[PDB]
Design an enzyme around this catalytic site. Sequence first.
Site, PDB file in Angstrom:
ATOM      1  N   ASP A 420      21.486 104.754  66.253  1.00 51.90           N
ATOM      2  CA  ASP A 420      21.669 105.739  65.212  1.00 51.90           C
ATOM      3  C   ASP A 420      20.658 106.875  65.311  1.00 51.90           C
ATOM      4  O   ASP A 420      19.554 106.653  65.813  1.00 51.90           O
ATOM      5  CB  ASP A 420      21.460 105.023  63.881  1.00 51.90           C
ATOM      6  CG  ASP A 420      21.993 105.779  62.670  1.00 51.90           C
ATOM      7  OD1 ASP A 420      23.044 106.433  62.838  1.00 51.90           O
ATOM      8  OD2 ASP A 420      21.415 105.624  61.593  1.00 51.90           O
ATOM      9  N   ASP A 489      28.685 109.683  60.253  1.00 54.20           N
ATOM     10  CA  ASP A 489      28.328 110.409  59.050  1.00 54.20           C
ATOM     11  C   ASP A 489      29.333 111.518  58.758  1.00 54.20           C
ATOM     12  O   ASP A 489      28.945 112.650  58.489  1.00 54.20           O
ATOM     13  CB  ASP A 489      26.917 110.964  59.101  1.00 54.20           C
ATOM     14  CG  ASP A 489      25.796 109.933  59.035  1.00 54.20           C
ATOM     15  OD1 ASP A 489      26.071 108.789  58.607  1.00 54.20           O
ATOM     16  OD2 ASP A 489      24.660 110.329  59.380  1.00 54.20           O
TER      17      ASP A 489
HETATM   18 CO    CO Z   1      24.495 108.191  62.545  1.00 62.33          CO
END
Ligand code: CO
EC number: 3.2.1.-
Length: 654
Positions: A420, A489
């Site tokens: 991430d 996201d």
């Molecule tokens: Co992300």
Amino acid sequence: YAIAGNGVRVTYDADGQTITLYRTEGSGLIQMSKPSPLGGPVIGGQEVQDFSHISCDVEQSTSGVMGSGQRMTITSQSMSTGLIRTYVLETSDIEEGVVYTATSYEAGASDVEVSWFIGSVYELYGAEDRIWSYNGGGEGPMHYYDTLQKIDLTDSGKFSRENKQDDTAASIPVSDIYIADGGITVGDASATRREVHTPVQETSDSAQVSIGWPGKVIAAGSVIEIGESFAVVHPGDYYNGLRGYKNAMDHLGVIMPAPGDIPDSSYDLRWESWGWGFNWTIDLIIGKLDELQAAGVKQITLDDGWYTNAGDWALNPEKFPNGASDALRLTDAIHEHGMTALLWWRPCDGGIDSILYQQHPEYFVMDADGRPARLPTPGGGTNPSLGYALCPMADGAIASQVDFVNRAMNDWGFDGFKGDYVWSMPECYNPAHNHASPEESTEKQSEIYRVSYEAMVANDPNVFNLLCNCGTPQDYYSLPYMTQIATADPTSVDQTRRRVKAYKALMGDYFPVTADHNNIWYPSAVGTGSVLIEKRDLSGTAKEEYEKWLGIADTVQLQKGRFIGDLYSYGFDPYETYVVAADGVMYYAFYKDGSKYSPTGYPDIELKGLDPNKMYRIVDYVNDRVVATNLMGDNAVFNTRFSDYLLVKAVEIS
Ligand SMILES: [Co+2]
Ligand SMILES: [Cl-]
Ligand SMILES: [Mn+2]
Ligand SMILES: [Zn+2]
């Protein structure tokens, strides 16, 4: 002068020095491109305009990058520069819609300084009021800039985007533009990451998609290859173009995981430990496991905040007061509830105040001033959470990633990873690294993803692996090493749903994609055939809502079904529509709540891809009601009123 491949024709006009692309439609052709100029070099801020036709050689039976097909080699000459351009187009007898292009330049008596090479440009033919575009660029803006962009031809503005891949942009080297009659995809034909742009640019009455690469000084008398691309003519929307690119890229060895090898646990309903933000504790997570298990969750992520520092990736003492035994009691509890456990990390980040940086600065990227280079955000800059970049060619950097993987799996009992909050990889100027060029670090970023995943697999072939280049299209060269993709996201239902289709196109119709959990959009998650995930600590009616939708997702299991992307065209069919085939049944999802494309009024719903000779009962499986009693497959048209979404299955009736 013309060549043909499966579903495509390419013609060259020697007088105008233009290329026209066509696709097949029935027994005829549809023109996809206006006559488009050959791409040229940019010198002193201007593309060279003086190229003249020398020759076009057509070979009807040849073998190229994509195997057997055809080739057209166009030679052009520029008197002002002394450059001879060789522009090669190849088609395939097998690969539908695909045109491979490669360009080389020879310099004459003197050196030529080129700042940029434009490879190929295609302006769409037959546009009316709007063109939809897929923009694979990694330059940002992050999060709130849609990957799918409408090019409005009736407004005042002129759409223009570069779509970069470079030391501050690591996304997907592909762009597509399309209308009702279909579109043209252009993508970088490279097995490895390199600097490239795939610009999308509104024209006077249409748009053009192109590809280009950084320039260089071409030495006198030298021949240099400057870049290679795939173009895809296609019916329908960006899914069809991106799927063509996937098929093309197979020939360069960029092969996405085959359906049969994807682990079962990469299709599982997942809850991630963000119920308390950074204030999660082991016991808070364990406390949720009974209710999560009962509701159908099969996977848990330990999210951000578990570690001392990036690079080190040691257990934070505040979160793990008893050390490794605490990590084990967490993963054991998860396992005891029939779930797999995932761990958050940021690959490529060696930290700043890490022991790793303190003891081994030589493992890190070094900037041109001799300082440690921060990991960049899209388009440049950094972020307080992002540490110094590990150089992907430094053995110790790679080993630090492998050691983390081995510890998390073998010492702590984790079953996979959620990478991430990382994007591109800065250029490396550390003389001790002996790089071929400063860009080599950027080019080799994906080595981290590959080696890490190979280590993961060696511990457990069913390991889960995901990487989120948040708010951007995922790093394309990471994709071969993944078991699931998040839409990354998304900030709207439009973003999450349209990206599900894009990722399916690139990865395969059975490749796991999650609609993510940035906002609560369970209908969007189910209807797109995505894995429904969540991160909140819910109660009251929101908890009931989550349980309801877990139950639906667990019943229809469209996340394991065959995504079908070629029946409906985003922005042209009346509704934003998704289709999944699961256990022999066609499931459709119609949405109106995406502000980027939503009909006026209540258009009729047409179900496509049914058997013409069969009759179907159309069932809203969310509400368990029949919306249409009996439609024939060849005229499966009905009207039902819904405010936001309609999720239906076509049940065959005898
Ligand atoms: Co992300
Ligand atoms: Cl999007
Ligand atoms: Mn406009
Ligand atoms: Zn380096």
